[PDB]
Design a protein around this ligand. Structure first.
Ligand SMILES: CC(=O)O[C@H]1C(=O)[C@@]2(C)[C@H]([C@H](OC(=O)c3ccccc3)[C@]3(O)C[C@H](OC(=O)[C@H](O)[C@@H](NC(=O)c4ccccc4)c4ccccc4)C(C)=C1C3(C)C)[C@]1(OC(C)=O)CO[C@@H]1C[C@@H]2O
Ligand SMILES: Nc1nc2c(ncn2[C@@H]2O[C@H](COP(=O)(O)OP(=O)(O)OP(=O)(O)O)[C@@H](O)[C@H]2O)c(=O)[nH]1
Ligand SMILES: Nc1nc2c(ncn2[C@@H]2O[C@H](COP(=O)(O)OP(=O)(O)O)[C@@H](O)[C@H]2O)c(=O)[nH]1
Ligand SMILES: Nc1ncnc2c1ncn2[C@@H]1O[C@H](COP(=O)(O)OP(=O)(O)O)[C@@H](O)[C@H]1O
Ligand SMILES: [Mg+2]
Lengths: 431, 359, 441
């Protein structure tokens, strides 16, 4: 049986974790105590993909929470669904990172990581088989970046045959919530592309626009954005959790979507997102979802793909539907929009279907894309990066904890090489 | 800015001739043809160079000295011009490889002629005004981990020290904490290689009791100190040069020999490195055709530690040691299909737009 | 007695079996609990026809089929579906992991450690039969399981059993439609191996069944079950020669003897003419002439391949129901009289006829309709080379950049295998191009 571990770092990963478990518990029928109140026997056949078992059928989860400041943990524990997580997994320390990547990878994070490894080996060896792990962090701060990347490196050095899938809230163009975002993000990308099998980039401005235009909300707090991210996490891994007609797994996605090992940074998306007063005036069918998915103002990548070409696509559907409509509509996407796709691959699309949809919708769909356009993110960060490195603005807070000016240059050159690697497959060259 | 691929078809061994297996590898002069013993399908192969060593009396013989004067001496001549140089080597166990690079005491290979011409031209070109310095490093790659072959480990068991790759911004990438010993005479080089090969990773699978499971790089670095100002003793322009010769392992296919263990984990990484290396060579050959293209170097370790020696104003070369028999046919074509990567002029189209060369 | 072992590999095969065994158990009066009220009413008779089923003392019957996926999302449905009391519990959920759509996982890393159980169970099935054998492997291209595990199983069964007919009712990829992007590589590496060990592998393509089910059955939002019941009817029309009685029987050997002239061209197509609904079931006579003119009619073939681009090397025709052979003679005379249906110079006979006595059945909740006669055609042509050529084009456009290979060497394969399979694939495309030539003195 396939089994997953959820590592959960930083002031962004833990709120996401709270929402993610508040969503999966409701899809598997669990209460804040642990008990089961479901309605169908399919709803616990594969609960072990995310959960464990207990004595009185309390169905405890698998989760490893790796913050350095106890604030987020003490906000989660005294919360709605923060009564089930195994209190031997509320790992923390003191003397927080301070939006510094050096205080999460080199000096302080090493005074906490060995405990986290001892927890990970426990949560792993008690699984029958393993399929991969997870990690929700941000890029822009210290804990989620540094501690998360160090855990990535060490875990992949331990269990390399298994999968490591990271859902990352990358920074935004306009309004940064931190001043040292580019440095941290770049030093992390130097350690993510090498030591990861699939990373799904996420941004907040795209989520703000997706919550303002589509859903026509007026007061979007982070609950609603993490609600969207959880809805994506959840439909990325239905194929392991419920029956289907053409099943799948995370390895299929990491294989078909990754032609070469570096270019695995993906644009995610979810459908049907509609306003709370406007579901009266729509038809829940397949082509409308396919239209809403490839649309640019629904993707969480802060990046119009129409600036570039699609390399490979993965569409995970949910609901009692027909496969002919799926294949036909994906063909019409491959055909009518050829300039937005790649030619040295004929078929830039695959599919997946589960016949057990979400709690209140007939059908749903989830989208993952590997594009050339995502370089616009990295191309921004580097342009943000070097202007600060050319004059060494905030350097000494990184050299006062065991670094040099060389590693920053390594990270910059790697990111720029990746930009060039993505550009190699963009310009419309005819033989 | 080249690939300069080459082959070498050895002559039959003694065991094979007593057992009397069949000759199947032939030659249409430069182009090669091979004929599966089932009379069914013929396969053709072309390379820029083809070496024949099967029977002496045939013209176009490929001796060891022919190999030197045809492949190696240009690398030396371009090293003296101040550029860098690399050389490769491929062959499954038994295809006559160690006899080609290293040679034997009475039958030299390629290495000794290279080093001896090096010393000769040193003692010729050198003056009271100019000098030459020369250092060596010799390391290996196992499961994409770097290891140094030029050291003795402790009395402990397998406590091999894995080193780290680091990108300098100007001088290019390098390995951290690598021994860089000095040499002046071949008696030192043979000693160092003999300390090396005895430490290399070897195992016993179904083919032979002694095989190679790790890549092995032999780097020399040379310095021209022609730095003499007219006003007085002051240095203008040293020139550094990086010569490289690498012995690569074979791409064992895991079907006839079940691996079931660590040997599989070695084979897979070995396969990966070879694929990436062929991919790089094809891209460099295309770059030599005036077509700008990407050169993936960070996708593997052996390339990332050899970036500056296969690009720009550098020079490269490959040699492929295969077998003539039929009992080693399946592992033979895999070499040749791995060494087709020149693709010089094969059905290139043509589109052009150029006008307004006037008022 | 006779017997035919039916194997299913992967999702495709398991779902096709969920349909095929529904049809089979409907034909022999069997109930989903294995029992038979019919023998409770009679007390005798071979109605529990044993070409596929095996008997016990409790009036119970067991199928002579196993199925394996390395993907337990499927088989647990059977174990907790309508047909759990029937099958032997020995169904291989060994799928601690999926095959990831790479031949290398199905052929070496996860292919190994799951095949010895399958061989032992096949041997236990075969030692319970004092008669014929035939491995009907319902598998798939594209995927890693149906490619790898299939190639390994047929390779080992070439050794352990040898001179026994092995067939495959495959699922050939559509040229435009697909649900996977590492699809062609697996197909090529499967053909390269199973060009030897197999004897005759049939082919279908889901694009053709989509078009056939919207054009004729008149249903516009179909699932995969409504595609699979048609294949189940194909299989039943084949095997009724052994199960039931008639006037001319065509066992499993006759297909591999009358449609496989050269060994390396054992890749035919198939079709099933009456696919009409209850509405169109009226307003139509349904004679043998209409069918035999409809089986050779494009847009009712089960693969997207214009036969008119090529020629028909051979043809088998397997009928069911009220058939007068005179009408068959007239129909084949008509088909030969036409000029848009070519034939090789070296096969004037061409046809192999087989006639049964039972009609088909009608599955409830289906789309097909009750009729008094049904037909299957199995044709061996020089047309599908074109289809293969498209594959052997796509491969190249993906292979020149070494895309999707690191995932293949990451599970133990070599680069050269790709080159060896493509080179071997070229040797077949010339054969389909060689026989089409008309001889000259
Ligand atoms: C017509 C109807 O059925 O009511 C819908 C509804 O009207 C809408 C507005 C729902 C609603 O979603 C939101 O309120 C929302 C608003 C902003 C941002 C994120 C969510 C809904 O609340 C959400 C809720 O959907 C679910 O509950 C899913 O199971 C979702 N889980 C949760 O929402 C959830 C439940 C308890 C605790 C935490 C989260 C889910 C998604 C993926 C996988 C598993 C579960 C449903 C049906 C609706 C309401 C209730 C209005 C939609 O929900 C999603 C994410 O698809 C928004 O568009 C869909 C469908 C509808 O448009
Ligand atoms: N006709 C038909 N084809 C199917 C059915 N189910 C799956 N397929 C085909 O199977 C192909 C993908 O199947 P696979 O990749 O082999 O999935 P699998 O059988 O579980 O094998 P693995 O994924 O490798 O484990 C698709 O292209 C489908 O067209 C079915 O029920 N009927
Ligand atoms: N999407 C989302 N992002 C968040 C949330 N909380 C914080 N962030 C992001 O996290 C970044 C700050 O990094 P932080 O979590 O403090 O890093 P840490 O201090 O190492 O844990 C900012 O860019 C925020 O936009 C949240 O609830 N949702
Ligand atoms: N051109 C050649 N002249 C003489 N002997 C050769 C030649 N090519 C190959 N051989 C013989 O082949 C054998 C190869 O030995 P071995 O070390 O197994 O080769 P490899 O380096 O491929 O493992 C040597 O004993 C050598 O004498
Ligand atoms: Mg599968």
């Amino acid at each position: 049986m396939r089994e997953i571990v959820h590592i959960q770092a930083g002031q962004c990963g833990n709120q996401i974790g709270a929402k993610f478990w508040e969503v999966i518990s409701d899809e598997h029928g669990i209460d804040p105590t642990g008990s089961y109140h479901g309605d169908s026997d399919l709803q616990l056949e594969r609960i072990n993909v995310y959960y464990n078992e207990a004595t009185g059928n309390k169905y405890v989860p698998r989760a490893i929470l790796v913050d350095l400041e106890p604030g987020t943990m003490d906000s989660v524990r005294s919360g709605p669904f923060g009564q089930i997580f195994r209190p031997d997994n509320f790992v923390f320390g003191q003397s927080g990172a301070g939006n510094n990547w050096a205080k999460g990878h080199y000096t302080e994070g090493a005074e906490l990581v060995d405990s986290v490894l001892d927890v990970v080996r426990k949560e792993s060896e008690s699984c029958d088989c393993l399929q991969g792990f997870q990690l929700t962090h941000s890029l822009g701060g210290g804990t989620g970046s540094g501690m998360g990347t160090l855990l990535i490196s060490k875990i992949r050095e331990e269990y390399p045959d298994r999968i490591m899938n990271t859902f990352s809230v990358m920074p935004s163009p306009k309004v940064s919530d931190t001043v040292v975002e580019p440095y941290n993000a770049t030093l992390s990308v130097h350690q993510l592309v090498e030591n990861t099998d699939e990373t799904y980039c996420i941004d907040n401005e795209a989520l703000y626009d997706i919550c303002f235009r589509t859903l026509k909300l007026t007061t979007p707090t982070y609950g609603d954005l993490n609600h969207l991210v959880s809805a994506t996490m959840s439909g990325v891994t239905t194929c392991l959790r419920f029956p289907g007609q053409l099943n799948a797994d995370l390895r299929k996605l990491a294989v078909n979507m990754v032609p070469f090992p570096r270019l695995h940074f993906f644009m995610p998306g979810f459908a049907p997102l509609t306003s709370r007063g406007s579901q009266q005036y729509r038809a829940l069918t397949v082509p409308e979802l396919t239209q809403q998915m490839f649309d640019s103002k629904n993707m969480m990548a802060a990046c119009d793909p129409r600036h570039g070409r699609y390399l490979t696509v993965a569409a995970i559907f949910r609901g009692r539907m027909s496969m002919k409509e799926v294949d036909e509509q994906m063909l019409n996407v491959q055909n009518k929009n050829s300039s937005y796709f790649v030619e040295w691959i004929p078929n830039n699309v695959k599919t997946a279907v589960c016949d057990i949809p979400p709690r209140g919708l007939k059908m749903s769909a989830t989208f993952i894309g590997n594009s050339t356009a995502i370089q616009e993110l990295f191309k921004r960060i580097s342009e943000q990066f070097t202007a600060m490195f050319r004059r060494k603005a905030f350097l000494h807070w990184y050299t006062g904890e065991g670094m040099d000016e060389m590693e920053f240059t390594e990270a910059e050159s790697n990111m720029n090489d990746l930009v060039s690697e993505y550009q190699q497959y963009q310009d419309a060259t005819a033989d | 800015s080249q690939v300069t691929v080459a082959v070498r078809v050895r002559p039959f061994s003694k065991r094979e001739k007593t057992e009397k297996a069949s000759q199947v590898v032939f030659t249409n002069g430069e182009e090669i043809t091979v004929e599966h013993p089932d009379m069914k399908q013929v396969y053709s192969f072309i390379y820029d160079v083809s070496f024949w060593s099967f029977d002496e009396c045939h013209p176009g013989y490929a001796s060891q000295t022919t190999v030197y004067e045809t492949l190696a001496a240009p690398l030396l001549d371009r090293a003296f011009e101040g550029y860098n140089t690399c050389l490769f080597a491929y062959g499954q166990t038994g295809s006559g490889k160690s006899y080609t690079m290293m040679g034997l005491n009475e039958e030299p290979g390629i290495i000794p002629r290279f080093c001896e011409d090096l010393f000769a031209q040193i003692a010729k070109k050198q003056t009271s005004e100019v000098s030459y310095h020369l250092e060596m490093s010799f390391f290996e790659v196992y499961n994409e981990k770097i290891h140094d072959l030029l050291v003795c480990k402790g009395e402990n068991g397998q406590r091999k020290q894995p080193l780290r790759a680091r990108e300098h911004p100007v001088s290019g990438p390098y390995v951290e904490g690598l021994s860089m010993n000095v040499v002046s005479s071949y008696s030192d080089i043979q000693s160092w290689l003999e300390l090396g090969n005895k430490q290399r990773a070897t195992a016993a699978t179904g083919m032979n009791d002694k095989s190679s499971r790790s890549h092995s790089v032999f780097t020399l670095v040379m310095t021209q100190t022609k730095t003499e100002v007219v006003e007085g003793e002051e240095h203008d322009h040293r020139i550094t040069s990086r010569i490289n010769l690498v012995d690569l392992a074979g791409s064992e296919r895991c079907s006839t020999a079940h691996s079931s263990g660590q040997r599989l984990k070695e084979g897979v990484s070995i396969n990966k490195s070879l694929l990436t290396l062929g991919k790089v060579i094809s891209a460099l050959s295309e770059q030599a055709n005036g077509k700008r293209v990407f050169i993936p170097y960070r996708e593997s370790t052996l390339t990332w530690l050899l970036k500056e020696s296969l690009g720009g104003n550098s020079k490269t070369a490959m040699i492929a040691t295969v077998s003539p028999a039929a009992s080693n046919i399946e592992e033979t074509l895999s070499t040749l299909r791995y060494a087709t990567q020149a693709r010089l002029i094969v059905n290139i189209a043509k589109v052009n737009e150029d006008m307004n060369a006037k008022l | 007695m006779r017997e035919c072992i039916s194997i299913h590999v992967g999702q495709a095969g398991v779902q096709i079996g969920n349909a095929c065994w529904e049809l089979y158990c409907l034909e022999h009066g069997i109930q989903p609990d294995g029992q038979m009220p019919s023998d409770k009413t009679i007390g005798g008779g071979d109605d529990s026809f044993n070409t596929f089923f095996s008997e016990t003392g409790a009036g119970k019957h067991v199928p002579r089929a196993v199925f394996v996926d390395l993907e337990p999302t499927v088989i647990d449905e059977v174990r907790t579906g309508t047909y759990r009391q029937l099958f032997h519990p020995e169904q291989l959920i060994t799928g601690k992991e999926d095959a990831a759509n790479n031949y290398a996982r199905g052929h070496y890393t996860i292919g190994k450690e799951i095949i010895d159980l399958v061989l032992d169970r096949i041997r236990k099935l075969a030692d319970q039969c004092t008669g014929l054998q035939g491995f009907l492997v319902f598998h798939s291209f594209g995927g890693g399981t149906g490619s790898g595990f299939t190639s390994l199983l047929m390779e080992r069964l070439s050794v352990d059993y040898g001179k026994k007919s092995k067939l495959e009712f495959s699922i050939y990829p559509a040229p435009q439609v697909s649900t996977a992007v590492v699809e062609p590589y697996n197909s090529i590496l499967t053909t390269h191996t199973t060009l030897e060990h197999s004897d005759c592998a049939f082919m279908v393509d889901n694009e053709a069944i989509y078009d056939i089910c919207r054009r004729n059955l008149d249903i516009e939002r179909p699932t995969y079950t409504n595609l699979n019941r048609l294949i189940s009817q194909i299989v039943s029309s084949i095997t009724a020669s052994l199960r039931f009685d008639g006037a001319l029987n065509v066992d499993l050997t006759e297909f591999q003897t009358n449609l496989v002239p050269y060994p390396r061209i054992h890749f035919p197509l198939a079709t099933y003419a009456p696919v009409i609904s209850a509405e169109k079931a009226y307003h139509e006579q349904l004679s043998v002439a209409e069918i035999t003119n409809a089986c050779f009619e494009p847009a009712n073939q089960m693969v997207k391949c214009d036969p008119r681009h090529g020629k028909y090397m051979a043809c088998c025709l397997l009928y069911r129901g009220d058939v007068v052979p005179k009408d068959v003679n007239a129909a084949i005379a008509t088909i030969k009289t036409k000029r848009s249906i070519q034939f090789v110079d070296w096969c004037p006979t061409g046809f192999k006829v087989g006639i049964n006595y039972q009609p088909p059945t009608v599955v409830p909740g289906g789309d097909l309709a009750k009729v008094q006669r049904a037909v299957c055609m199995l044709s061996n042509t020089t047309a599908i080379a074109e289809a293969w050529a498209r594959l052997d084009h796509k491969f190249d456009l993906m292979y020149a950049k070494r895309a999707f290979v690191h995932w293949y060497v990451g599970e133990g394969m070599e680069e050269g295998e790709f080159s060896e399979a493509r080179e071997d694939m070229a040797a077949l495309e010339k054969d389909y191009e060689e026989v089409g030539v008309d001889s000259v003195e």
